[PDB]
Structure formats: structure tokens, C-alpha cells
Amino acid sequence: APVRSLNCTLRDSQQKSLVMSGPYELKALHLQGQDMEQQVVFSMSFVQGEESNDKIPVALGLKEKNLYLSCVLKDDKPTLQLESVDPKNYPKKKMEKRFVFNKIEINNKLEFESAQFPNWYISTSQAENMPVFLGGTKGGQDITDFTMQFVS
Ligand SMILES: O=C(CC(F)(F)F)N1CCNCC1
Fold it and tell me: Which helix (H) or strand (E) holds 44?
């Protein structure tokens, strides 16, 4: 059948919101009130991949945009990028591996591990207004835990 998708927002465990701030750029900052309209709405697709009770393979598209979070090597490192696709062909159930995250539920928080690069996670910095990135440890100063708000 089709691929199933839900609209949602993400906030890091510091309670920073995510916003589209430049061509292919997502930023984490503290947001409340009117400015909350600026936050990015995701279409989270439930995709093909290895699955267990608390580990669910997803793709993260931007709502009604042909843009997906993806994990690729750049200048020889696992990095997070926003990648454009053919809007006729996406989303699909069999997303290419660079688009797949393992959504992991631990202690009432979510982590998003790269399917392509084991133990690399969607991360934010403690500082305001810095890029969302792929970080090679769910330990230390960078933030790898999120919560998920469901959107109409
Ligand atoms: O924000 C990103 C990647 C993203 F979060 F959008 F996926 N950056 C910063 C701008 N250049 C690409 C890497």
C-alpha cells in the first residue's frame, strides 16, 4: 500500500525548536509564542528497515517540500544534509538508506540514529542558533535526545 506518514515537530531535550533558516539549513533555538510558527514541520514516514519494539525506521521529510534529512560522507565524515528529491517519487516505503533513521524510544525521549552510520545521531549544540548535525556519540555536551509533538 502507500507509505504511512505523520506530521510532527521535534524539540531537543533542552527544549530548543528547529527552524529552516537558510537554503538547506536547519537551526535549533529557544522559541515561544508568535515565533513558534517559524518551526519546521516534518512529515515522518514509516519506512522499510530492521525494526524492534523501541527502534522504528523512519524518514524525515519537510512537510509539503521535496526535501529529506539524509546522512552522507562529506569531506570524509558522516554528515547530516537536507537533500532534494523528485517529488513524483517520494515519499516511498523503500527509502534509500541515507534517508533512514532508527527512531529509538529511551526513558520517554527519542533519539534518531543514522541507519547508514551506526551510532551517529541527529544532534544539536547547547548554544542557540547553531546547525543541526550528525554527531558520532549519544554521550557528552551535544544533545541527542528529542521529544515529538504531533501536528494536524
Ligand atoms: O543545517 C545543515 C544540515 C541540515 F540540518 F539541514 F540537515 N547544515 C548547515 C548548512 N550547510 C549544510 C549542513
Answer: strand 42-46
Q: What whole-number distance in Å separates Cα of residue 125 and Cα of residue 143?
A: 6
Q: Residue 68 C-alpha to ligand 1 middle, in angstroms?
A: 11
- HSE-CB for 31 with a 13 A CA cutoff: 19
In short, whether 82's Cβ falls inside 6 Å of ligand 1 is yes
Identify the CATH assignment for 1-152 out of 2.60.40.10, 2.80.10.50, 3.40.710.10, 1.10.10.10.
2.80.10.50
CB-CB neighbours of 27 under 10 Å: 20
| Residue to mutate (ligand 1; options 60, 70, 122, 132; most atoms within 8 A of CB) | 132
Distances (CA, A) of 38 to 27, 130, 151: 11, 16, 14
Q: Is the CB of 129 under 6 A from ligand 1?
A: no
Which residue minimizes the CA distance to atom 6 of ligand 1? 25
- Report how this structure was experimentally obtained: X-ray
